[PDB]
């Protein structure tokens with residue numbers, strides 16, 4: 001009546017936002033709409049504080065610790081989540097829920113062929129090769145201040161010989177085809193498994209945890225007391241394997257995110 005749910009410009013965020021909206025409409029007389037194409041963690045933040053969205057469907061602890069809170073990035077998942085929950089309530093009167101069950105981290109990714117030829121297992125293993133590698137990346141990370149490229153080169157001490165910003169969606173074919181040698185992929189993309197790509201271990205733990213949760217203002221929860229119980233039904237229920245399969249249905253089987261969400265909810269009987 002009517003609850004506006006924000007989605008970041010990722011297939012994953014569209015699937016989860018549609019799944020949550022469908023679950024609310026299954027249980028209650030609330031109407032839901034989806035506010036798509038929010039560009040970033042910061043965009044979703046300001047939209048929560050100014051009333052443009054009532055629920056942010058997918059927020060990530062690693063994005064909010066650096067970007068929003070300007071805290072030093074905690075590297076343990078459970079600690080990072082508890083610190084995020086605490087500060088979001090204190091600073092913003094926002095409720096950062098427990099995780100849906102999956103984490104979507106940046107991951108340096110190569111073809112199995114390249115990994116096998118040069119015995120690549122970790123990010124540190126590419127240090128000696130960096131000047132000769134072509135890196136594909138999304139359109140934000142090169143300029144990102146927390147754990148973006150600037151800080152990466154300082155921490156790992158390597159600089160790639162060529163950089164190639166593109167829509168996140170495009171990196172998977174770029175690396176499989178061999179047009180790029182290495183890409184900064186998102187770990188829940190379903191093409192990593194389907195294309196047989198190799199994720200390199202972040203041995204320095206340069207990246208923080210990116211556990212995913214819904215975030216809602218306390219004022220919205222007070223006015224709609226049934227929302228809390230509905231959101232709880234999705235928590236702890238969607239593991240990374242499941243999220244990759246759902247992303248695959250959109251990016252590989254070319255389904256609408258609303259259709260992928262409706263078929264999952266039907267298969268799993270709306271979580272009860």
Ligand SMILES: C[N+](C)(C)CCO
Pocket residue numbers: 040041060063104105106186187210
């Ligand atoms: C959540 N990621 C780390 C994959 C992308 C930035 O929102």
